[PDB]
């Protein structure tokens, strides 16, 4: 017959190879597909829709609906902080279990700009401004409104608009950042400070609520597929 | 199926074969390369730049900076020798640990012309000449300026130029010479003698310094890749 | 600008789904010690035993994948007094029973000598036996989630288990007897290829409990932290 | 993969077969041949030149 020769790597089962196989049942007449609506062709199309972030996750608010319920109130002196978290999707325990976070955890690299959207669910007669600021990693973390005004920020009035979009820009030395975040590929800090106040006419409740959604922009991409460190089991389910 | 037949040499792992393999992670999006300056495409481009030879390696000068510090001085009678070594790069312990020498030791054959460059680091008011001579192997080694004038030589004044280039020509019976030098493929002897003197005006120090660099010319080439007999280890580094 | 880059090739459906994921670990022997680890084991085909592949499929509501089934069949020698015995190589059989067909009621039944049910014979030492099956369904997609009942009276069985009739899979040793008992382990590796996934679904938070329903325990939405506003200079 | 089938006569070492092999040292730069005089291309060219026969081979 034809003289062949066996290269190393034969009679092995790599779980990520791309080979053909003999079919078990041949000449099968499959059922014709129909126009089922809403077909998805990529995993980033799931990650480009919003999902409200559990920012107020101080214990034990995570067992209730109060995890999504960032509180604001009329102040005494301005410039105070509202909330703040690190920009570590997939690792920081604020935006880890959101819809963007559960998709990066099947991967080991991410890159691109994230989009934060807010929604002030207060009264229709209250008015106030905020200072939502992104800060590059550098050194260090800002501890004042005077410090977190030099970075990237916007100013959001709640008497004019109810929703504000903050495109967090991609600033890094590398082309990708690791999902399980180490010290080398840092990403920075998101903070939100009182610009003026919350001012309200009489007979309105004081404490209000801000929702916060996270999404992905168009330049978002992920790499190096892996399995998620969320599910665990030992024996087979019965 | 197709009738094949297994030639001898199958299911073997030669460490220097050239075969394809199934990829472990497919459809990988690699990072785009940038214009990092100074790209090297051959090992001889490293070996064509100079590196100062430790000629004065008499013990224990190799543990200091005095190994590169060939001394000259005003003489009493002329014709004396300055230095001298064998032309065995990769094996002779003068030009073995230079930049040309550490590259031949990854190989088992060399061929081509070597280039020796000098640099007189003396005073600006001193004057003198030297006789830098290459001698073919033959028989034997010269022991006088009268004997090492019949071979290839140049005459180098230090009052005119500070740097002299001596292209050592390739004279051999074979096309290649072995790096681990045996008796059959000899290469010859490099010597350097006083042509006139070192003459200096008053209030100048006597003992001066000559540096010596070794390089490769354009017709240099190496063959028969091997591993270097310089590094050694027994257990894995931890 | 910067011009840009980084195509989303690994975020695709087929690159995310096509990986040989183990779905069931079948266990059988030669000498019957007890049940289980009896000779002649079986397994009705479902993809909801292993939590790794189950969570991947349950981010989409309807799937239309083909399959690639691979077995990694290794055998260990059972503990006894002596072990010294020359033995011929073990031959293994994996028979696929379609939904409704006749089953082997025991070992040495003539259902292993049938003419329609496909079977894969394989001796120990070679490459793993890999075979492919097409899109086995009666609807037009694989319902991962079916919110309804089995009977028209709204009774009987709640869940997706009514729309799961993929068949069975029967494992046995072909060889008649060994001099000393040998326990074998067969691992089924599904690989979904030619995938079409329609309705996206929010991913599972709390870990599964059973292989037939979506019953769960209450878990908080995320891990906690100390204070809401982080602070340092 | 491609379905093949092993004809008898495989994994055998016949000492007079004509097959290719993976090279141990690849990209070797061999030395250029020179015009060495008197090249022979056949064993009968040796056998077509004379050689004096030991006819008187009676001992000793």
């Amino acid at each position: 017959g034809l003289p062949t020769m066996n290269t190393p790597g034969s009679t092995q089962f790599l779980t990520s190879d791309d080979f053909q196989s003999p079919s078990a049942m041949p000449q099968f007449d499959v059922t014709p597909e129909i126009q089922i609506p809403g077909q998805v062709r990529n995993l980033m199309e799931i990650a480009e829709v919003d999902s409200v972030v559990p920012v107020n996750n101080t214990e034990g608010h995570v067992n209730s609906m109060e995890a999504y319920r960032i509180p604001v109130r009329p102040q005494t002196s301005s410039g105070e902080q509202v909330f703040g978290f690190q920009l570590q999707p997939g690792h920081d325990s604020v935006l880890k279990h959101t819809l963007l976070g559960e998709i990066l955890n099947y991967y080991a690299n991410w890159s691109g700009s994230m989009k934060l959207t807010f929604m002030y669910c207060g009264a229709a007669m209250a008015t106030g401004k905020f200072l939502i600021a992104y800060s590059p990693p550098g050194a260090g973390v800002p501890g004042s409104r005077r410090d977190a005004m030099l970075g990237t920020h916007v100013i959001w009035d709640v008497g004019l608009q109810s929703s504000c979009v903050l495109c967090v820009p991609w600033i890094s030395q590398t082309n990708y950042r690791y999902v399980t975040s180490d010290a080398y590929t840092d990403a920075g800090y998101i903070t939100c400070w009182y610009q003026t106040s919350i001012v309200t006419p009489p007979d309105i409740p004081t404490t209000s609520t801000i929702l916060c959604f996270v999404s992905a922009c168009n330049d978002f991409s992920v790499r190096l597929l892996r399995d998620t460190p969320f599910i665990t089991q030992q024996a087979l389910f019965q | 199926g197709l009738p094949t037949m297994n030639t001898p040499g199958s299911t073997q792992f030669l460490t220097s074969d050239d075969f394809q393999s199934p990829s472990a992670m497919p459809q990988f999006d690699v990072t785009p390369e940038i214009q990092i300056p100074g790209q090297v495409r051959n090992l001889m481009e490293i070996a064509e730049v100079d590196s100062v030879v430790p000629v004065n390696n008499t013990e224990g000068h190799v543990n200091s900076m005095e190994a590169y510090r060939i001394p000259v001085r005003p003489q009493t009678s002329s014709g004396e020798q300055v230095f001298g070594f064998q032309l065995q790069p990769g094996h002779d312990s003068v030009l073995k640990h230079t930049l040309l020498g550490e590259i031949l030791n990854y190989y088992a054959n060399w061929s081509g012309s070597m280039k020796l460059t000098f640099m007189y680091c003396g005073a600006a008011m001193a004057t003198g000449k030297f006789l830098i001579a290459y001698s073919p192997p033959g028989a034997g080694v010269p022991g006088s300026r009268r004997d090492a004038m019949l071979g290839t030589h140049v005459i180098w004044d230090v009052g005119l130029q500070s740097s002299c280039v001596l292209c050592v020509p390739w004279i051999s019976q074979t096309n290649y010479r072995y790096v681990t030098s045996d008796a059959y493929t000899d290469a010859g002897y490099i010597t350097c003698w006083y042509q006139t003197s070192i003459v200096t005006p008053p209030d100048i120090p006597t003992t001066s310094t000559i540096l010596c660099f070794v390089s490769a010319c354009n017709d240099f080439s190496v063959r028969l890749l091997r591993d270097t007999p310089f590094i050694t280890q027994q257990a894995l580094f931890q | 600008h910067v011009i840009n880059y980084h195509t989303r090739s690994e975020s695709s459906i087929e690159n995310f789904m096509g990986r040989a994921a183990c779905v069931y670990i079948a266990q059988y022997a030669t000498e019957k010690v007890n049940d289980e680890l009896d000779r002649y084991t079986n397994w009705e085909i479902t993809t909801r035993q292993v939590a790794q592949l189950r969570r991947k499929l349950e981010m989409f509501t309807y799937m239309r994948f083909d399959l690639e089934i691979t077995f990694v069949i290794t055998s260990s020698q059972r503990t006894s007094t002596t072990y010294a015995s020359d033995s011929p190589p073990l031959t293994h059989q994996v028979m696929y029973v379609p939904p409704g067909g006749p089953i082997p009621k025991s070992y040495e039944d003539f259902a292993w000598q049938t003419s329609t049910n496909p079977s894969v014979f394989w001796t120990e030492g070679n490459a793993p036996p890999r075979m492919s099956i097409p899109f086995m369904s009666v609807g037009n997609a694989y319902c991962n989630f079916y919110d309804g009942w089995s009977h028209f009276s709204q009774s009987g069985v709640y869940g997706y288990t009514t729309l799961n009739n993929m068949g069975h899979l029967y494992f046995r040793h072909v060889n008649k007897s060994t001099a000393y008992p040998v326990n074998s382990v067969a691992r089924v590796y599904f690989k979904p290829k030619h995938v079409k996934a329609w309705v996206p679904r929010a991913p599972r938070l709390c870990p599964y409990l059973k292989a037939r329903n979506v019953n769960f325990n209450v878990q908080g939405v995320t891990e906690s932290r100390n204070k809401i506003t982080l602070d340092r200079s | 993969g491609l379905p093949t089938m092993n004809t008898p006569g495989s994994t055998q070492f016949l000492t007079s077969d004509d097959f290719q092999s993976p090279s141990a040292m690849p990209q070797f730069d061999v030395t250029p041949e020179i015009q060495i005089p008197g090249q022979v291309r056949n064993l009968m060219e040796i056998a077509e030149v004379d050689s004096v026969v030991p006819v008187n081979n009676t001992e000793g």
């Binding site: 791309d18 080979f19 053909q20 196989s21 003999p22 079919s23 041949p26 000449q27 099968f28 | 497919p26 459809q27 | 087929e14 690159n15 096509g18 083909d66 399959l67 492919s132 099956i133 097409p134 899109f135 290829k193 030619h194 | 993969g1 491609l2 379905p3």
Partner: peptide, 17 residues
Amino acid sequence: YTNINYYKDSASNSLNR
């Protein structure tokens, strides 16, 4: 990327890449 098909079935093919 030779892209030849040895078998007669569609479900016996390789992945779509």
